[PDB]
């Protein structure tokens, strides 16, 4: 009663606690060992940064039971506006002691006012300065401290290990983790503190800097005592948004902290942080759903972008089944980047808007539900830092503004991104409500959230651990596992970092967590470490625990190589995941830790593995894994040699193939995969299996696990994208097996005969095997083939249907809704002159059909599986979607047929048969089945910009063309600095963002989408908005786009007000006519806008809506008029044979011969005579413009100034070019015709035009040395550092051709003197070979500056 101390007891320890303060005097373990707490009378409580010392009257004590005591602390300071009552609980269980703040009463406040209003006098922070919950002294045997801080740098360890001596002096030294050891005991301190502090290396904030342990020294008699305390806790924090508005936000959780006292837990004869770390796992926070991390063998990204629907959800489910077959059912983790709105970086931050063109929430739920049966987990990429005007969440309150009141702009790509006010988004409850919208859609089906960019300071200048903890909480509260971008981010709750798992990003300073303490504690809970990537060195040079190496094959950054994806899983990820099924118990001889980097007391042992690195791991059943390094010397070939043992038996050995792709290794393994792909429980003894891999290929012998020792044989299967193949029965003798393996080929070993994993391809897709993933057998079991030709499944990467000759491939459609409207589209690449078709039939009769002749447009969709960088045939891909539209029959009898009509040997490729509900009804046909009219408001587009297809203005790219969406007023002209409407009519339009000055096609129709019959006339019209005059043009062409072979009509500015365009088109003789939008060489008028306003304004954009194409009546012609038109054309051009290109004459003869076929056919009609006449009229206007172009080239070359002015007035194109790209400007600059150069530039000639060799007019101005022409070109915007085919800048051609004063002019305008030719030649080296002495010394003076 009078005694100022009490005792709490467990079966493991007795703790003496003080009655006048929640402090421990000491912990006494059952064996008599003692650990100190706070030996001194320290009664400090910090509130809001003010230290208050408590007296006897400020504390009441109550011993609740033998395991618990409660304290009531009166914490008061009138001068600092603090009057609080803190209730503190101390509880003990086993070797653990918990200290919890269970109640905080503020006497100076009524609470947080509604809506998170400011709470005056709020208790914002709380801590117990120098509480010393556990402590060690310099007088104790082997007294030491081990601490960890965040490091994303492979060369800078995050740990410190030092002896605690009389000279140790620290005051609130902060760490993520801190452990003290001394006198045979070790302990770590755990806290839920959101404090941010000291770190070793990190490129971002976002929870990277969370330090929760404070170490402080004090004198205890003649010894120095080092004590551990919790870092401060946030309670009711007051924050400010980007507009100056203040809020008080309640605590994420109440303050909590704990210690766990360890003896020699790993039984190795030494007591250090590792023993404390083993006990620490019993008290530490564990990231939500971290127990499934060892199961996630196959991580990858499935991408959608720019309205294209490259990866609809039901296709993602088929790719999950393909990976399940190839890995024998290992767990997967599929990150859906672009699951929402129009795709990736569209619709942020509308978390609940699931991409309707992908199949919406219904297909997403089917993919998640069915995928989970194959151990596949799914998650979505979200952004809480940047938003687009189209998102319904976009509002003035959501907008982050700068100190001047302007928008905090983000990135412009498809649309202009704007920063989100992170503090407003949290304190208003907006973000959590948007996550609730997504929760209503996915229920409990979704595994995780991937939070992009958090920590890069785009939402505010803070994004601290407190904000990150609340962000992770609102996500975990919906049943979602937390994952994020940056390697160092969110130490508290993240189970995956993209910049840790994908080792190629960021470089050596910005990878996963480089800490032995953190990885010892949590390797099994996260994919947030440093894997093998030897060019980074240090931590990335063959980590013994491996580390996740992530590759993709579904479009992310153009990644499409399935074989490389699977090879990578077996090379690094199977052993990494195997190791994660065990927890580290011992880690000695770490070569990254030295006396020089603050780790003199690092855990060492010369009697373990020759004094080289070794890690021991164990599971809860007592299974033991030992991972050993061959040598600790990085110069030794043995540094990268690793052996893995499972229960004393070797299961892996050798050097892994370098994680950076630089060198193949020799590693082989026979890993026992004992777990299921769901919760990771042990599978039944009979279905236990082994995975075999042999990097170089060959024969290796292995000792089987103990439970296999009495078998006489095993079954071995080679794993492919079809599952288990090539079964072999391999004898077992003396419990050993010998395996012959091909290089880099996976095998699975079973005790007896194994069954094939059952796969029903394309569930929910209305056809079986819509992606041709079922091998050759799919053409027997699923699709029916008929005809004399050939149908085969081709392609070692993304398999396709390949047709040759006359062949039909059919399949009945299932699960259609009778009477409902459907679109059916299929990817088609036709290399044949004969038609490739898609037909839907019902009871023998045709409901819908469509065809394409030879494909004319290459595929430039980077996230798509058959873009032109994927080699469908001959190093290209012309894959484009071909649509049919039908109403599902009442009889429920519908069949799709894919066919090749011609009997030639050329190929047709098909892939991804997609049957989708769709209400589009804008096509009308003539009685013959030809086009009568096509209208499109883009309101019912199944995907893409149909009837247009993205062209090559940006090469294979995540193309800056998509379907724009209405969200007034933010998407309309007049909001902020925006001058163009995103949408012209309804909710959707086709938008082109900033594709100015490309001098090439942006998008075009193709015949499979809109067929223009040979000789027929069509009126085409559309509504548009264009940012400036003549930046975009209407293009009309025939066949595959060829520069010079198209008709261009510049469009005038329509900025903020919708313009109307209309023109006529006559179909070309080959049925391959098209129209599109073209980016000219004309510079946009930015109207004095600067910075982000140049992109957000719309000056460089083009929006198109309400397309209308209609067949029109043409004046009727007789056979005689058509024949006379032939004679007129022949009289005008038959003589110009020599005056024409060999290709120009053949194109002329082709049109002529084909027009005559129409005229002279037996039974021809007035329609044929009219078509032949219209074809000849179009041919006439084309040949007449070609002649004016070559006459303008001749007049610019020969210096006929008057001829140039009159030729352009008649119709010569100022940007005309010969077969080799030589323009009139190239010709006048080379010839020295200054006035012609100026007139051409005034008319709109492209100053930076390239010829086939990359030579610009400025390059050609250096052959003779025209000084005045170089000045004019430079003044008009010529690139002074333009490099041609041989790497020569204009400076290299002037010095090589010996023209001194041109060089002087080039050097003045900013021609970088450091620039190197295709050889090792600077402009100085070019003058040495041509005697240009005065040039050499002049640029030598400029280079020294």
């Amino acid at each position: 009663s009078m005694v100022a101390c009490e005792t709490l007891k467990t079966k493991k320890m007795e703790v003496q606690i003080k009655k006048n303060f929640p402090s421990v005097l000491q912990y006494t373990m059952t064996d008599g060992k003692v650990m100190y707490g706070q030996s001194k009378d320290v009664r400090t409580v910090e509130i809001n940064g003010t230290n208050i010392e408590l007296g006897d009257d400020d504390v009441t004590f109550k011993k609740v039971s033998d395991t618990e005591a409660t304290y009531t602390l009166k914490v008061k300071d009138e001068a600092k506006k603090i009057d609080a009552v803190i209730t503190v609980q101390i509880t003990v269980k086993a070797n653990q002691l918990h200290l919890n703040v269970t109640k905080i009463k503020n006497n100076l406040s009524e609470g947080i006012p509604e809506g998170n209003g400011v709470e005056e006098n709020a208790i914002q922070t709380l801590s117990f300065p120098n509480q010393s919950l556990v402590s060690v002294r310099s007088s104790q045997e082997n007294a030491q401290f081990t601490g960890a801080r965040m490091s994303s740098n492979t060369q800078k360890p995050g740990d410190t290990n030092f002896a605690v001596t009389e000279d140790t002096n620290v005051t609130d030294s902060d760490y993520t983790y801190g452990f003290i050891s001394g006198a045979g005991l070790s302990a770590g301190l755990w806290s839920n503190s959101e404090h941010d502090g000291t770190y070793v290396a990190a490129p971002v904030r976002g929870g990277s800097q969370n330090t929760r342990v404070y170490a402080t020294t004090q004198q205890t008699g003649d010894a120095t005592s080092l004590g551990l305390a919790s870092a401060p806790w946030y309670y009711h924090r007051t924050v400010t948004d980007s507009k100056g508005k203040k809020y008080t936000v309640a605590e994420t959780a109440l303050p909590q902290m704990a210690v766990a006292i360890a003896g020699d837990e790993n039984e190795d004869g030494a007591v250090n942080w590792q023993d404390g770390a083993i006990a620490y796992r019993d008290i530490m926070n564990n990231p939500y759903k971290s127990e499934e991390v060892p199961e996630l063998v196959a991580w990858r990204i499935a991408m959608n972008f720019g309205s294209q629907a490259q990866n609809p959800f039901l296709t993602t489910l088929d790719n999950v089944k393909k990976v399940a077959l190839n890995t024998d059912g290992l767990g997967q983790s599929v990150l859906l980047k672009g699951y929402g709105n129009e795709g990736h970086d569209s619709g942020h931050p509308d978390y609940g808007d699931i991409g309707q063109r992908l199949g919406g929430a219904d297909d997403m739920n089917t993919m998640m539900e069915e995928g989970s049966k194959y151990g596949a987990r799914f998650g979505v990429h979200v952004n809480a830092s940047e938003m687009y005007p189209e998102a319904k969440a976009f509002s003035e309150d959501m907008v982050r503004r700068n100190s001047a009141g302007g928008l905090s702009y983000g990135w412009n790509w498809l649309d202009q991104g704007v920063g989100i006010d992170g503090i407003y988004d949290l304190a208003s409850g907006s973000r959590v409500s948007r996550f609730a919208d997504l929760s209503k859609e996915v229920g409990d089906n979704m595994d995780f959230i991937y939070l992009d960019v958090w920590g890069n300071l785009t939402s505010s200048g803070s994004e601290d651990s407190w904000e990150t903890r609340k962000m992770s909480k609102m996500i975990n509260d919906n049943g979602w596992r937390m994952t994020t971008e940056w390697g160092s981010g969110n130490e508290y709750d993240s189970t995956f970092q993209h910049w840790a798992a994908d080792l190629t990003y960021g470089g050596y300073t910005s990878k996963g967590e480089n800490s032995e303490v953190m990885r010892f504690l949590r390797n099994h809970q996260k994919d947030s470490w440093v894997g093998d990537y030897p060019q980074y060195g240090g931590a990335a040079n063959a980590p013994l625990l491996g580390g996740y190496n992530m590759k993709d094959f579904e479009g992310w950054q153009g990644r499409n190589d399935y074989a490389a994806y699977i090879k990578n899983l077996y090379t690094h990820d199977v052993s990494t995941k195997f190791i994660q099924h065990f927890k580290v118990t011992r880690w000695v001889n770490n070569p990254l830790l030295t006396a020089d980097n603050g780790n003199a007391a690092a855990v060492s042992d010369p009697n373990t593995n020759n004094g080289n690195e070794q890690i021991t791991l164990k599971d809860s059943n007592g299974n033991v894994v030992v991972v050993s390094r061959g040598s600790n010397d990085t110069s030794s070939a043995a540094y990268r040699q690793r052996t893995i043992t499972f229960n004393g038996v070797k299961v892996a050995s050798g050097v892994v193939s370098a994680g950076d792709g630089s060198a193949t290794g020799d590693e082989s393994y026979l890993l026992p995969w004992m777990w299921d792909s769901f919760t990771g429980k042990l599978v039944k003894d009979s279905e236990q299996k082994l995975y075999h891999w042999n990097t170089k290929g060959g024969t290796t012998t292995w000792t089987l696990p103990d439970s296999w020792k009495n078998l006489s044989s095993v079954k071995v299967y080679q794993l492919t994208d079809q599952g288990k193949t090539n079964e072999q029965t391999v004898a077992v003798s003396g419990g050993k097996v010998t395996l012959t393996a091909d290089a880099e080929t996976p095998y699975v070993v079973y005790k007896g005969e194994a069954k094939q994993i059952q796969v029903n391809w394309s569930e929910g897709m209305h056809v079986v095997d819509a992606g041709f993933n079922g091998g050759s057998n799919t053409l027997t079991d699923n699709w029916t083939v008929s005809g004399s030709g050939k149908a085969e499944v081709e392609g070692d990467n993304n398999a396709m249907l390949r047709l040759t000759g006359k062949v039909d491939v059919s399949q009945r459609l299932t699960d259609l809704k009778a009477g409902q409207k459907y679109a059916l589209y299929v990817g088609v690449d036709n290399r044949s002159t004969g038609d490739a078709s898609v037909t839907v039939t019902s009871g023998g009769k045709v409901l819908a059909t469509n065809s394409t002749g030879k494909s004319i447009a290459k595929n430039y969709i980077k996230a798509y599986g058959h873009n032109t960088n994927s080699n469908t045939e001959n190093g290209s891909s012309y894959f484009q979607n071909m649509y049919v539209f039908f109403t599902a029959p009442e009889n429920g009898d519908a069949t799709v047929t894919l066919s090749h009509k011609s009997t030639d040997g050329a190929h047709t490729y098909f892939d991804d048969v997609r049957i989708v509900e769709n209400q589009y009804s804008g096509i009308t046909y003539e009685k013959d089945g030809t086009l009568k009219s096509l209208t499109n408001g883009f309101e019912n587009n199944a995907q893409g910009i149909w009837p247009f297809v993205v062209s090559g203005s940006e090469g294979v790219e995540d193309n800056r063309i998509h379907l724009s969406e209405l969200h007034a007023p933010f998407t309309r002209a007049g909001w902020d600095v925006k001058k163009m409407d995103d949408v012209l009519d309804g909710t959707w339009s086709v938008k082109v963002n900033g594709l100015t000055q490309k001098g090439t096609l942006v998008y075009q129709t193709i015949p499979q989408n809109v067929k223009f019959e040979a000789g027929a006339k069509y009126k085409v019209s559309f509504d548009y908005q264009s940012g400036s005059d003549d930046i975009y043009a209407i293009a009309v062409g025939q066949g595959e786009y060829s520069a010079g072979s198209v008709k261009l009509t510049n469009l005038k500015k329509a900025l903020g007000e919708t313009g109307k365009a209309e023109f006529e088109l006559t179909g070309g003789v080959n049925g391959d006519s098209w129209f599109g939008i073209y980016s000219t060489a004309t510079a946009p008028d930015l109207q004095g806008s600067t910075g982000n306003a140049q992109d957000f304004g719309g000056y460089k954009d083009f929006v198109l809506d309400n397309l209308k194409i209609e067949r029109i009546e043409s004046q009727t012609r007789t056979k005689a008029e058509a024949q006379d038109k032939v004679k007129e054309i022949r009289g005008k051009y038959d003589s110009k044979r020599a005056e024409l290109s060999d290709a120009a004459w053949q194109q002329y003869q082709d049109t002529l011969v084909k027009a005559r076929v129409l005229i002279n056919k037996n039974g021809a009609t007035a329609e044929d005579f009219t078509k032949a006449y219209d074809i000849l009229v179009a041919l006439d206007e084309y040949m007449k413009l070609k002649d004016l172009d070559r006459k303008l080239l001749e007049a610019a070359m020969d210096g006929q100034d008057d001829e140039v002015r009159i030729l352009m007035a008649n119709g010569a194109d100022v940007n005309a070019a010969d077969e080799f790209g030589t323009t009139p400007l190239h010709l006048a600059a080379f010839a020295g015709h200054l006035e012609i150069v100026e007139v051409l530039l005034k008319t709109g000639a492209d100053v930076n035009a390239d010829d086939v060799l990359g030579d610009t007019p400025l390059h050609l101005a250096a052959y003779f040395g025209h000084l005045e022409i170089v000045e004019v070109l430079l003044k008009d915007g010529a690139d002074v550092n333009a490099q041609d085919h041989w790497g020569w800048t204009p400076l290299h051609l002037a010095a090589w051709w010996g023209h001194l004063e041109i060089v002087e002019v080039l050097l003045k305008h900013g021609a970088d003197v450091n620039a190197q030719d295709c050889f090792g030649k600077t402009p100085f080296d070019l003058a040495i070979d041509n005697g240009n002495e005065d040039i050499a010394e002049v640029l030598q003076k400029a280079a020294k500056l």
Binding site: G1221, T1222, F1230, D1251, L1253, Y1263, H1285
Partner: peptide, 9 residues
């Protein structure tokens, strides 16, 4: 006259 035949001289 583009670079090809110009270089050749």
């Amino acid at each position: 006259p583009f670079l090809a035949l110009l270089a050749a001289x």
